[PDB]
């Protein structure tokens, strides 16, 4: 007996009941996904379409066939991905690492040292100290590069070494 004047109790109410079933068949309906934005040339971690991993992402010129979603190299390590939205090929490089070594003339003589980061580009060291030198063996902090040549006191590598005169 729905009438415009029937009070709150007699109001016509539309009711929809939603039931969820998750039978053994593969799921077909899911909620939103909320993808974030993109960064480059920075050591970050990612979960591209459920594929997780850390490293630095750069632009790459590899050409995928229109049906691959990512690529990997020999020894089964992922090297490239394709972003699901822009559909372009990005390259992955592991974040840099290495060992550190200390060059000292001996506590007997002095107590100032120099530091060498092995196989690391002289761009992400940190911290400042003195002038910083870049060598084929890594990056060196706390010594001055000269143009003379002598015998080798403390071998460093790639045909260069250091001595105490300062270091």
């Amino acid at each position: 007996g729905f009438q415009p004047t029937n009070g709150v109790g007699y109001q016509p109410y539309r009711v929809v009941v939603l039931s969820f079933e998750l039978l053994h068949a593969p799921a077909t309906v899911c909620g939103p996904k909320k993808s974030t934005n993109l960064v480059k040339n920075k050591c970050v971690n990612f979960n591209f379409n459920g594929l997780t991993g850390t490293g630095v992402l750069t632009e790459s010129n590899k050409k995928f066939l229109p049906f691959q979603q990512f690529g990997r190299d020999i020894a089964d390590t992922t090297d490239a991905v394709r972003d699901p939205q822009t559909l372009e090929i990005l390259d992955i490089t592991p974040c840099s690492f290495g060992g550190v070594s200390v060059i000292t003339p001996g506590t007997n003589t002095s107590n100032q040292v120099a530091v060498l980061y092995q196989g690391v580009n002289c761009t992400e060291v940190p911290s400042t100290g003195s002038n910083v030198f870049q060598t084929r063996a890594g990056c060196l902090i706390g010594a001055e590069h000269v143009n003379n040549s002598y015998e080798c006191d403390i071998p460093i590598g790639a045909g260069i070494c250091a001595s105490y005169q300062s270091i």
Binding site: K33, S35, V44, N47, N49, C95, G98, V100, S101, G106
Partner: protein
Amino acid sequence: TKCTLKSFTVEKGIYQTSNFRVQPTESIVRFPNITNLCPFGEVFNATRF
């Protein structure tokens, strides 16, 4: 150097002490475009039930 070598005096040379690695800055999440919505508006905004 003194701690790794376990002595209060250090002889002249070069010694390997520790390791260095860069830390991640932030996290990035990427996913395909949101499309093919589940039709609910037409049922819920239907004139006749």
